Coordinates of C-alpha atoms in Angstrom, one line a residue:
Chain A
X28 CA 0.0 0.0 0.0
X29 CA 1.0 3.9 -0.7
X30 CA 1.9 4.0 3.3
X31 CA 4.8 2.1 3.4
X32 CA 5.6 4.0 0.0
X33 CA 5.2 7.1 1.2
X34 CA 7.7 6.4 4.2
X35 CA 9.9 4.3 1.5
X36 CA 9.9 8.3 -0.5
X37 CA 10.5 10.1 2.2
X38 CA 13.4 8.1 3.7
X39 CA 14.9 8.4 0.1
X40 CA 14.4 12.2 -0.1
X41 CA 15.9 12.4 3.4
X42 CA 18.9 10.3 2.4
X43 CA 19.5 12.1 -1.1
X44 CA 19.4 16.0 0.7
X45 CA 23.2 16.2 1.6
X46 CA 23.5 14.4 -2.5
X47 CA 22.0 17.8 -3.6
X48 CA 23.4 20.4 -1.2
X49 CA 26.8 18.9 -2.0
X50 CA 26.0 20.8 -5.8
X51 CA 23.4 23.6 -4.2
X52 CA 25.5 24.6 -0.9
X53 CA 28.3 25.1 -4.1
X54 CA 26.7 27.5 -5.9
X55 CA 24.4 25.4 -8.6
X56 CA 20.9 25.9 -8.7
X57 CA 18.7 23.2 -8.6
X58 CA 15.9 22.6 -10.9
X59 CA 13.3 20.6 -9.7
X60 CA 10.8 20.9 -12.1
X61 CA 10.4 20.9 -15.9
X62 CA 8.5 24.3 -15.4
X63 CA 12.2 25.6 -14.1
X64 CA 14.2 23.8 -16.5
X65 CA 12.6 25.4 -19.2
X66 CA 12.4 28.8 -17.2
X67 CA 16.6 28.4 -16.7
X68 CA 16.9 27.6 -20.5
X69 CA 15.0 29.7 -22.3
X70 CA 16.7 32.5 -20.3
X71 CA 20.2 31.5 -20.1
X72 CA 22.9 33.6 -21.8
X73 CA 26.7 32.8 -22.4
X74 CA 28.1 29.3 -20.5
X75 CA 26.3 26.8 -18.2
X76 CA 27.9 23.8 -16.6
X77 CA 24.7 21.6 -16.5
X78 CA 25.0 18.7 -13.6
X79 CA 23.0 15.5 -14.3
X80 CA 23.3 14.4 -10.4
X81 CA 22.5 11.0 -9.2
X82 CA 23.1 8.7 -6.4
X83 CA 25.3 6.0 -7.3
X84 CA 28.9 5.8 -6.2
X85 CA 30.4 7.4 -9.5
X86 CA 28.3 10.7 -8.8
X87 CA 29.8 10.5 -5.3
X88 CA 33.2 10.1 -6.2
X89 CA 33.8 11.6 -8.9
X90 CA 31.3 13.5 -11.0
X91 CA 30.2 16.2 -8.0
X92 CA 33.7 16.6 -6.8
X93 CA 35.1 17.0 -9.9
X94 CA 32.5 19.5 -10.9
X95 CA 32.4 22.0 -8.0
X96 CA 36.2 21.6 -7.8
X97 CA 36.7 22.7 -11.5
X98 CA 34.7 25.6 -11.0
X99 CA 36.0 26.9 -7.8
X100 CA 39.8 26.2 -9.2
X101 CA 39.6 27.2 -12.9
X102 CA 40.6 30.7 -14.0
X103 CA 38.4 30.6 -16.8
X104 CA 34.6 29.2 -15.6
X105 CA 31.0 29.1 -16.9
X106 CA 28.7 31.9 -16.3
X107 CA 26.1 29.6 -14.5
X108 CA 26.0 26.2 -13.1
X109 CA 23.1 24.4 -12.7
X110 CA 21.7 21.0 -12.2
X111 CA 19.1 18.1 -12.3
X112 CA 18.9 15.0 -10.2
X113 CA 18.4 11.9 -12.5
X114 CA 16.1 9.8 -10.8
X115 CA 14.9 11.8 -8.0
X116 CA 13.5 14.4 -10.2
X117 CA 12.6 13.3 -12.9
X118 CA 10.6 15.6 -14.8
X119 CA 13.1 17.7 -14.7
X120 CA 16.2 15.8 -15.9
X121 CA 13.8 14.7 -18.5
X122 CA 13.1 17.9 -19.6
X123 CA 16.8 19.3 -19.4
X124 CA 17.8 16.3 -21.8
X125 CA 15.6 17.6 -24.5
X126 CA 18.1 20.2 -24.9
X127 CA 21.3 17.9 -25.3
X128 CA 20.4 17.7 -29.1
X129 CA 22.2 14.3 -30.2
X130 CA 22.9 12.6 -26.4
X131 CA 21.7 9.7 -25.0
X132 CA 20.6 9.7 -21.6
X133 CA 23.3 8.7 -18.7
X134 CA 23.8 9.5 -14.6
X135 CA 25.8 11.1 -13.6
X136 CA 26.7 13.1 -16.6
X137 CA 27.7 17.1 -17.5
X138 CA 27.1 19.6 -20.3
X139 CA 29.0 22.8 -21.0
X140 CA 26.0 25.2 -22.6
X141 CA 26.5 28.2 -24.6
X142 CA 22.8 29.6 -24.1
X143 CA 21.0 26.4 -24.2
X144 CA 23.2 24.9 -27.0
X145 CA 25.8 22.0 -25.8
X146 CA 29.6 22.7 -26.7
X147 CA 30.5 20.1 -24.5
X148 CA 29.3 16.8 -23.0
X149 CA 30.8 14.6 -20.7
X150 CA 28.7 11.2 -20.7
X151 CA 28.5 8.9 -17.6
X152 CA 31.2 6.3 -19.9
X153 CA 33.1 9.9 -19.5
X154 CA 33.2 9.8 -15.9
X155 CA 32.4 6.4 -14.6
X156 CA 36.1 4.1 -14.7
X157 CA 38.4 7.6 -14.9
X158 CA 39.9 9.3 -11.9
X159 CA 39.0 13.2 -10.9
X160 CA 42.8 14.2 -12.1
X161 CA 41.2 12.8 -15.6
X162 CA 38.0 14.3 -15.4
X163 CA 38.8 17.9 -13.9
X164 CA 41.3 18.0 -16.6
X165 CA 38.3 17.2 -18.9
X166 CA 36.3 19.9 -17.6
X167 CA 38.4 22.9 -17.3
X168 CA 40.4 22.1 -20.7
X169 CA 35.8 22.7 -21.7
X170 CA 36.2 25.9 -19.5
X171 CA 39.2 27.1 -21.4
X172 CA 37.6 26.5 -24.4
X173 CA 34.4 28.1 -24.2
X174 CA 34.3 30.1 -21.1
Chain B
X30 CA 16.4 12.4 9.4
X31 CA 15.6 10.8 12.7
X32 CA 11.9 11.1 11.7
X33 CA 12.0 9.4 8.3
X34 CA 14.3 6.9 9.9
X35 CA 12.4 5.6 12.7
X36 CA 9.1 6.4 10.7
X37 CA 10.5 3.9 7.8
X38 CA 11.2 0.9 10.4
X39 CA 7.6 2.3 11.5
X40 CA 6.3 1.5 8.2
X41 CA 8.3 -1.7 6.9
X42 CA 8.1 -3.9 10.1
X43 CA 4.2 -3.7 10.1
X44 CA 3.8 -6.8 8.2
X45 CA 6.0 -9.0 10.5
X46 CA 3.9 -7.0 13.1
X47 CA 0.7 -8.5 10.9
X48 CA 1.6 -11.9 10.8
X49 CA 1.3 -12.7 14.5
X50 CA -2.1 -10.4 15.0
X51 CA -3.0 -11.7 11.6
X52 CA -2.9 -15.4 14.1
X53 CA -4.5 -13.7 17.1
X54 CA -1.1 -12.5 19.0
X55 CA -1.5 -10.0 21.3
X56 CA 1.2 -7.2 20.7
X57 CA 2.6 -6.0 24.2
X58 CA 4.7 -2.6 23.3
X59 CA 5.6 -1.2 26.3
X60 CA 7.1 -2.3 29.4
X61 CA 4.1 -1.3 31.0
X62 CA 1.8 -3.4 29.1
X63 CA 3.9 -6.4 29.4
X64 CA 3.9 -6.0 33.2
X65 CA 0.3 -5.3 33.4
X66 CA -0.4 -8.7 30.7
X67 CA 2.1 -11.3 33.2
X68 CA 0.2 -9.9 36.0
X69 CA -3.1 -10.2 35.3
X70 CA -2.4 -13.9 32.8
X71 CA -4.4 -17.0 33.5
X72 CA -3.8 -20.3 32.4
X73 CA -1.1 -21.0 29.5
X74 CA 0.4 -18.3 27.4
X75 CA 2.6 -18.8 24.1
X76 CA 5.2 -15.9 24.2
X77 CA 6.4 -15.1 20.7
X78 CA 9.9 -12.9 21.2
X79 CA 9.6 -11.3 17.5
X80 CA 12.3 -9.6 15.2
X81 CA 12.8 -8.7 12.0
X82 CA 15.7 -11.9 10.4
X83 CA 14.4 -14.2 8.1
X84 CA 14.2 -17.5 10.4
X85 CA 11.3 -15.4 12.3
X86 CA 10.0 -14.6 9.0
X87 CA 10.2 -18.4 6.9
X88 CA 10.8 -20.6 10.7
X89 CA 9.5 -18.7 14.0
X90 CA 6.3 -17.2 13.3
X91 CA 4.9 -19.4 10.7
X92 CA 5.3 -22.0 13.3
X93 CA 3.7 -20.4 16.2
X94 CA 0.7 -19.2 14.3
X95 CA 0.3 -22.7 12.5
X96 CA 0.5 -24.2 16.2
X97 CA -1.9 -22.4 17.6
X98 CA -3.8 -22.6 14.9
X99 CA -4.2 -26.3 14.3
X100 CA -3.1 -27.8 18.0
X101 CA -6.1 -29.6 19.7
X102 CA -4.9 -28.3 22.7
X103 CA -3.4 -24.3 23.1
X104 CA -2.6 -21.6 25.0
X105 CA -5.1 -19.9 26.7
X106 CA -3.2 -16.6 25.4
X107 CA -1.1 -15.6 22.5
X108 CA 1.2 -12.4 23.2
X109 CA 4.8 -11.4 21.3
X110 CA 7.0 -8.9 22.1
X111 CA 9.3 -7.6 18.9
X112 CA 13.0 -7.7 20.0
X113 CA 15.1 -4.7 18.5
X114 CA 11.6 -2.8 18.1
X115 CA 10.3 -2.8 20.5
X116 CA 13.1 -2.7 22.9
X117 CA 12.1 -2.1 26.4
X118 CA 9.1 -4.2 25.9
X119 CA 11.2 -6.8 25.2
X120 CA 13.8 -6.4 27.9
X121 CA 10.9 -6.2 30.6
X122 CA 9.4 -9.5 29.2
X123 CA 12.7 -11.4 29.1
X124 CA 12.9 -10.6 32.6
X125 CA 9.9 -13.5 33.3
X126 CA 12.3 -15.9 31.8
X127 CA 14.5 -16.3 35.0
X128 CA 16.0 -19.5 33.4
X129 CA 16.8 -18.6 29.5
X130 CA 19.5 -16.9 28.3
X131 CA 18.4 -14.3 25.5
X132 CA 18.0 -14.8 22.2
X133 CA 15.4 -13.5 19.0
X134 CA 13.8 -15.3 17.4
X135 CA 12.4 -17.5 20.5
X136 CA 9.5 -18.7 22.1
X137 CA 8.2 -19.2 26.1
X138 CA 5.4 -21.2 27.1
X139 CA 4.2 -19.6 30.3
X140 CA 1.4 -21.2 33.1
X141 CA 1.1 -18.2 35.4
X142 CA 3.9 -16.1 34.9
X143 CA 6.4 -18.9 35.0
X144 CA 8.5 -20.1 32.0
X145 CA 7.4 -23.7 31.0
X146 CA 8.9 -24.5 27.8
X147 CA 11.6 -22.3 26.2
X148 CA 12.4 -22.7 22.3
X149 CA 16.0 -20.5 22.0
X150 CA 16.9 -19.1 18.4
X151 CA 18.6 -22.2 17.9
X152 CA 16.0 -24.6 18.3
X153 CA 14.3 -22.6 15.2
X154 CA 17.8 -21.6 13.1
X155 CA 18.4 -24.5 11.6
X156 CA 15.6 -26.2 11.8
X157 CA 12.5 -27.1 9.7
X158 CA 8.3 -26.5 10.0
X159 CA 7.1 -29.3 11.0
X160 CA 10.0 -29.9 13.4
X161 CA 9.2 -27.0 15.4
X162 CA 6.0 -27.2 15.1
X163 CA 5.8 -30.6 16.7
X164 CA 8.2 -28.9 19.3
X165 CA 5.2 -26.4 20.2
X166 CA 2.5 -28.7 19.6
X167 CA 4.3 -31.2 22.5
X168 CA 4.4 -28.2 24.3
X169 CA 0.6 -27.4 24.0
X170 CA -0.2 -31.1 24.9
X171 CA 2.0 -31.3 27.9
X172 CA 0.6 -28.1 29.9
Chain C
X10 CA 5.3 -0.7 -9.9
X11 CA 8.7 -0.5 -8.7
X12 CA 11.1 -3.1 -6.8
X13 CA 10.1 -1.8 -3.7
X14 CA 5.9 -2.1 -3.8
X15 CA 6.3 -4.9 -6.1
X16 CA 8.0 -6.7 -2.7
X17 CA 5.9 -5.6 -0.5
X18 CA 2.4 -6.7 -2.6
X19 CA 4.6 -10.3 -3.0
X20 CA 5.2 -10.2 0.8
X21 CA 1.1 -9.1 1.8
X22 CA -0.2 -11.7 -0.5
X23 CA 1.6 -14.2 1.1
X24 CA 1.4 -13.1 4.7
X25 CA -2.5 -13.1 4.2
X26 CA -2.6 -16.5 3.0
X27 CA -3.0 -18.2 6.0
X28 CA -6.0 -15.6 7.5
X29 CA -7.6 -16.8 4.2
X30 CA -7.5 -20.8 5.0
X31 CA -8.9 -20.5 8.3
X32 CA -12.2 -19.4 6.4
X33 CA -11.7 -21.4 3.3
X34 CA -10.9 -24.3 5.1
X35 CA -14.5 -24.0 6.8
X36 CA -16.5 -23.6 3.7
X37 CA -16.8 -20.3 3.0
X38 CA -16.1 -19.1 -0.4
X39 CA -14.0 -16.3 -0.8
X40 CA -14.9 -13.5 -3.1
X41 CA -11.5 -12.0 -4.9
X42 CA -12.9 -9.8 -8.0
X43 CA -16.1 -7.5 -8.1
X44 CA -17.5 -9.7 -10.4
X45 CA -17.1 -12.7 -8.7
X46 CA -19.3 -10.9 -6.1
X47 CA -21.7 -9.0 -8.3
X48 CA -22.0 -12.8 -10.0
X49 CA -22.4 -14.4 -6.5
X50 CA -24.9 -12.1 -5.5
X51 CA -28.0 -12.2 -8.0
X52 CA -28.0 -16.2 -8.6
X53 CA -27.7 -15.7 -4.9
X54 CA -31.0 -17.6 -2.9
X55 CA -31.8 -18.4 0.4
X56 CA -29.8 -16.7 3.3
X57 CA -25.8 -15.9 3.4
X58 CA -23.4 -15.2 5.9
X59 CA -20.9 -12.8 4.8
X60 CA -17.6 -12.2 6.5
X61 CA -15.3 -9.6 5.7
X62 CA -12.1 -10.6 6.4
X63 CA -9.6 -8.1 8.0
X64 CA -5.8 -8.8 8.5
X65 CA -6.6 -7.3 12.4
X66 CA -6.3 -9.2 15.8
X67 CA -10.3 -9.3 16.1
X68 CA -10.3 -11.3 13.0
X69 CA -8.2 -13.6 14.2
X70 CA -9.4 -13.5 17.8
X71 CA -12.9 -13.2 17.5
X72 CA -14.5 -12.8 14.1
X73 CA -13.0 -15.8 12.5
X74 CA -13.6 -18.6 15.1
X75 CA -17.2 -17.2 16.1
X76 CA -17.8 -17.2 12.4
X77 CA -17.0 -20.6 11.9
X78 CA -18.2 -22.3 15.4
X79 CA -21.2 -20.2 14.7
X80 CA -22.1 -22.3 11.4
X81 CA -21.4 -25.7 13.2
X82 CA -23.5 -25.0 16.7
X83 CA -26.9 -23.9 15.3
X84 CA -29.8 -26.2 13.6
X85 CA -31.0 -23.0 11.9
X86 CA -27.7 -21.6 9.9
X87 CA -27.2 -19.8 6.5
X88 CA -27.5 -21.1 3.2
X89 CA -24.7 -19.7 1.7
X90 CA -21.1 -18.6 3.3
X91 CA -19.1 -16.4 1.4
X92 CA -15.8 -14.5 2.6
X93 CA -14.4 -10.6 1.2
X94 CA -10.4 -10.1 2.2
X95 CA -11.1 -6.2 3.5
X96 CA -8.0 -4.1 2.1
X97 CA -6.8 -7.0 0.6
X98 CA -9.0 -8.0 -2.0
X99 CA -10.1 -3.9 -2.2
X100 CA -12.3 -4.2 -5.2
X101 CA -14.1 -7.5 -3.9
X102 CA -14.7 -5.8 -0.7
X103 CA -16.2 -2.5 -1.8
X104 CA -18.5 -4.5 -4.3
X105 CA -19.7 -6.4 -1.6
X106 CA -20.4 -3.4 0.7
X107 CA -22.3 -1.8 -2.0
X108 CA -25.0 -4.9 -1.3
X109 CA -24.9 -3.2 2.1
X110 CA -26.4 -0.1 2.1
X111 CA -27.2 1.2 5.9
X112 CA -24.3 -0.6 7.3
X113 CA -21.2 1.1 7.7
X114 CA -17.9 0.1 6.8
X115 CA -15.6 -1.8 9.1
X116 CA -13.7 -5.1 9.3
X117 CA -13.9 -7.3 10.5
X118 CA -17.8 -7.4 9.9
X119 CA -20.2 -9.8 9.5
X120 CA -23.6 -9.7 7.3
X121 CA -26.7 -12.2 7.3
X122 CA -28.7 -12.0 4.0
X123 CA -32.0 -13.0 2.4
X124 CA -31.2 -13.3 -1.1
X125 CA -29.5 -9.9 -2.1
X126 CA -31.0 -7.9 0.8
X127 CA -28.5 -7.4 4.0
X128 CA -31.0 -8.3 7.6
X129 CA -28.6 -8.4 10.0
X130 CA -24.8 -6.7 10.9
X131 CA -22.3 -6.7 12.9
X132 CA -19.8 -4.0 12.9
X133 CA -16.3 -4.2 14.0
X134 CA -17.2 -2.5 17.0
X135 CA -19.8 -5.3 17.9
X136 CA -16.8 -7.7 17.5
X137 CA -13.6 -6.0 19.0
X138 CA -13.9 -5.5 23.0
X139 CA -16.2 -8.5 23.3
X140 CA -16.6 -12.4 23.9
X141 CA -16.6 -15.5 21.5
X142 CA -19.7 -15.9 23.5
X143 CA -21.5 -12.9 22.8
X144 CA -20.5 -12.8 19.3
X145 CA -21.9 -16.1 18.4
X146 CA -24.5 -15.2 20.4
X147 CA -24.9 -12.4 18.2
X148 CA -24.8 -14.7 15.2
X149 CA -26.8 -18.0 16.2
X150 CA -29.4 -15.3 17.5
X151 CA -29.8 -13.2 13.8
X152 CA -29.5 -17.5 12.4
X153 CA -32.4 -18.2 14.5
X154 CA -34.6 -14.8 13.3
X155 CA -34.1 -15.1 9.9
X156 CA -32.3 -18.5 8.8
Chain D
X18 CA 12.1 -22.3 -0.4
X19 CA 8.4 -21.6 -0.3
X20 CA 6.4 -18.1 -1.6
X21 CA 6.7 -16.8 2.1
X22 CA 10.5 -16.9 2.4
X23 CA 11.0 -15.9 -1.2
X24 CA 8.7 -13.4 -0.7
X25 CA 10.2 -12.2 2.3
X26 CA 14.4 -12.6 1.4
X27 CA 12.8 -10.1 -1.6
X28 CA 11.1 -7.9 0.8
X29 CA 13.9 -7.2 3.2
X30 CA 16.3 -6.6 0.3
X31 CA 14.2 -4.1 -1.2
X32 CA 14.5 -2.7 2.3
X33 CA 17.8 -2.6 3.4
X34 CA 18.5 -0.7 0.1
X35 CA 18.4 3.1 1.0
X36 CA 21.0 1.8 4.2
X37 CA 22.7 0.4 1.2
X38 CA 22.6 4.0 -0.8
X39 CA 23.6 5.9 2.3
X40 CA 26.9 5.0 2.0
X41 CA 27.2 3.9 -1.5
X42 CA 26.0 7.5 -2.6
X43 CA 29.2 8.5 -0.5
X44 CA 31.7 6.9 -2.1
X45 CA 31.5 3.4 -0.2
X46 CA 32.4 0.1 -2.0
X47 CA 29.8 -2.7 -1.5
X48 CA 31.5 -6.1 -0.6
X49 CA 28.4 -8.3 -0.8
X50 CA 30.0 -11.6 -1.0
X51 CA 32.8 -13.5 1.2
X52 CA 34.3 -14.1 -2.6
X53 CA 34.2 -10.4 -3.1
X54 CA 35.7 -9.6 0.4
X55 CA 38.7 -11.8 -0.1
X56 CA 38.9 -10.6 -3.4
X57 CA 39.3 -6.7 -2.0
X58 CA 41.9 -7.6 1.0
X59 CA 43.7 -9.9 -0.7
X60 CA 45.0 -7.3 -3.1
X61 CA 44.3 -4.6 -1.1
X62 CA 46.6 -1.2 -0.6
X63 CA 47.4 2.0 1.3
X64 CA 44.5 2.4 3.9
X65 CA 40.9 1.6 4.0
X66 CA 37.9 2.7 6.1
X67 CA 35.7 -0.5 6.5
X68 CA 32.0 -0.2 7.9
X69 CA 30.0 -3.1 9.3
X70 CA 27.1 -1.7 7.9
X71 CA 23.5 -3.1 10.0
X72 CA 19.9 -2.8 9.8
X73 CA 19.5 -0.4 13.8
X74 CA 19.1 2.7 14.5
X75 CA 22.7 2.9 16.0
X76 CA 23.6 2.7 12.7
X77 CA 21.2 5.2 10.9
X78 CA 22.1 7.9 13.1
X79 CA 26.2 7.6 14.1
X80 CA 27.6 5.0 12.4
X81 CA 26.6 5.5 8.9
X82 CA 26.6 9.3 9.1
X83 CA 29.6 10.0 11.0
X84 CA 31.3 7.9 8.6
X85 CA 30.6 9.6 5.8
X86 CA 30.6 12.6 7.2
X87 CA 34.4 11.9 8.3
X88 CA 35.3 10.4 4.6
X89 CA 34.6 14.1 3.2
X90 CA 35.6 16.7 5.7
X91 CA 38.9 15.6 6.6
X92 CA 42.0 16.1 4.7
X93 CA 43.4 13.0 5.9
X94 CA 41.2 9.9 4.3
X95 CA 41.6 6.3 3.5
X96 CA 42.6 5.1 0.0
X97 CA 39.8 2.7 -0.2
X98 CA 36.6 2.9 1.8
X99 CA 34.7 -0.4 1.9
X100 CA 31.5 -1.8 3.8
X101 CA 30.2 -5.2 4.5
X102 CA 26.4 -5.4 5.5
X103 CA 26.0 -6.9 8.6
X104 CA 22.6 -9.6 9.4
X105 CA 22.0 -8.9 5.6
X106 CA 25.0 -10.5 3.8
X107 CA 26.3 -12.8 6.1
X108 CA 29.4 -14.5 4.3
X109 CA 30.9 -11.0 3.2
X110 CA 30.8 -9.9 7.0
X111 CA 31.8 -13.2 8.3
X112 CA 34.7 -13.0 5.8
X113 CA 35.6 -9.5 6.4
X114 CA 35.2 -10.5 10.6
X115 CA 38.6 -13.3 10.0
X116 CA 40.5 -10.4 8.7
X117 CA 39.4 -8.5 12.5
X118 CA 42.5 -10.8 14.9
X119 CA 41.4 -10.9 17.7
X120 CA 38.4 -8.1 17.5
X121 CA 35.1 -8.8 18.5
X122 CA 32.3 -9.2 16.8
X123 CA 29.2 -6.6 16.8
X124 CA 27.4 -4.0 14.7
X125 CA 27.6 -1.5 13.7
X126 CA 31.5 -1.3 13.6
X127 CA 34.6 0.2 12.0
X128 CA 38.3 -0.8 11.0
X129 CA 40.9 0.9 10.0
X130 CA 43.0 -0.9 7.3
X131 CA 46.9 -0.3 6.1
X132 CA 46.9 -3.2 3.6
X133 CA 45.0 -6.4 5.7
X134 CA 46.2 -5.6 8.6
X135 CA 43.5 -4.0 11.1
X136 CA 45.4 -0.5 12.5
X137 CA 42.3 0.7 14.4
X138 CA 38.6 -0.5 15.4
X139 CA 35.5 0.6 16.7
X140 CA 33.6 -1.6 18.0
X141 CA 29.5 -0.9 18.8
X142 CA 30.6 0.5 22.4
X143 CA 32.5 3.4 21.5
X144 CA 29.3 3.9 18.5
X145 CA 26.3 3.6 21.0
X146 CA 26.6 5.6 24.0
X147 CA 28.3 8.6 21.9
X148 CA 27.2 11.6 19.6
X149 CA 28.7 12.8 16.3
X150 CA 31.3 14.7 17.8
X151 CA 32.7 11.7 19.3
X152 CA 32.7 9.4 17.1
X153 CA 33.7 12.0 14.1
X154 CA 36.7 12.8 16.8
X155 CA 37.7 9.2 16.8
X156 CA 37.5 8.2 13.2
X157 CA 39.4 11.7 12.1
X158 CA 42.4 11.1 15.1
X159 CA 42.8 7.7 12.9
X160 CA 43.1 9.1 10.0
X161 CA 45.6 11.7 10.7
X162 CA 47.5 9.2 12.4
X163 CA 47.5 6.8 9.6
X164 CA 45.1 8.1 6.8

């Protein structure tokens, strides 16, 4: 029945809050809702890092760390940073992968906008197997091309 | 956090909760009840000390509430206590069984207030249905 | 539809197996779809006892047992017994209650008909807080004015 | 094997999962399996954090947290963090627990790895009874002493 579900939910939303605030408490909006994704991207002028967040290990590890740390490091950066949490909002993520013209869907995963148009795209294969070293690297060699 | 925490046990241990009401076991939750139940208890009572493992779940209480069920003769009450759940509850009721050493699953077969028959965890790990059945239903049909 | 409820409906259906044997195993036919009630209920002559099954200690305790000792102990006793699993069998259950109009809903409960037409009840409140005695009472008493 | 304990083994994996994802979504390995567990120490290097993971609240609201908590705040970390599931997978904890000389057994705990050998523990005692603070004091003094 939806009681145990609802408690199941809730437990998971509780569980996933430091997952988000690790990106939010760094500076990238959240959007939560395909009403905001569209509201972000239909407004958004010169670069966005976009965040596909998730929960596995690999967004743990590497993808969030290697984000915020890239931003906060880089000389060059994106004018915005912003994200969507595959899975856990899903409405959302689905909507913000609309705009990856050509992708396929994967968690975590990362685009580099200029307005809503993707420069650059780092796919969970991208990510997943490769150390932050690698994927910072990946990331701000984006930044210095674009930003 | 805490909330959702203890709210999601809440939620998810309802069904093992279920299966020995679902069989007409009284659920003691407090301390207070337990003392009030021993207390006042007449005649034979099958104490089921409940938790949440899987020989409880496919060994204990499946063979209680089959017992019970289908025994000629049977206790004159059915109560359980949920170890790890419902802790003090369980620590209070534990203290009736002057001669057992601790353990969840297990069963007590009380007259009174005094332990009878004790089934430890490891008369039900390990072991089969019908084999502890038979080890309640011997029970039932010596007291 | 996920892992999670799919578990916990496979758990529940198994876990209420045995509350429906007790009743099973004394005749009464259980009623699992709205149309296996609505079918039951028009070709339906004579007088039935109806017991909605609950997964609750007074169904265990009291409902059940006077239910079934109920049947036995009495020269005058229903035609027809038929079972509903309340909040398991939800569909079943609400068909049923429909056929009850004036009663409210409750489980356990317990319903005497003649034909189609509910003339006797007994609420979960006539069953929780009282005696295998006065239950059966209850019933063999309602068996004895209408059966 | 019957539906019931199908049913159930199903059920309590589905619900053991989010204490699975509270540590997995922080960068913790899984060691499900005695293979796995040899597996991991047998090759293992530098340091490693291990948690005996379990299904109590002891675990939901210090070990788990402070954990993870530690893992990301301090400068000092281990090479590897690891966790075995206590009550749930019982060979990969029994494994991991004949790597523990001459530790005792109980959940939730914490070892401290350089290589196999086990360079500091926390067992349940030092857990329950304490708060964040002290627990988060112990596990950091560890790794600043050893990583």
């Amino acid at each position: 029945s939806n009681a145990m579900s609802m408690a199941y939910e809730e437990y998971m939303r509780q569980l996933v809050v430091p997952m988000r605030r690790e990106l939010t408490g760094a500076g990238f909006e959240e959007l939560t809702t395909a009403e905001e994704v569209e509201n972000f991207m239909e407004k958004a002028e010169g670069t966005t890092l976009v965040v596909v967040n998730s929960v596995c290990g690999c967004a743990a590890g590497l993808a969030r760390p290697a984000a915020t740390q890239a931003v906060l490091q880089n000389d060059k950066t994106p004018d915005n940073t912003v994200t969507v949490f595959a899975g856990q909002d899903k409405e959302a993520t689905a909507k913000m992968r609309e705009y990856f013209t050509g992708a396929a869907p994967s968690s975590p995963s990362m685009a580099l906008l200029k307005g809503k148009e993707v420069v650059h795209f780092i796919p969970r294969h991208e990510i997943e197997g490769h150390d932050m070293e690698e994927i910072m690297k990946n990331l701000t060699a984006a930044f210095d091309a674009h930003c």
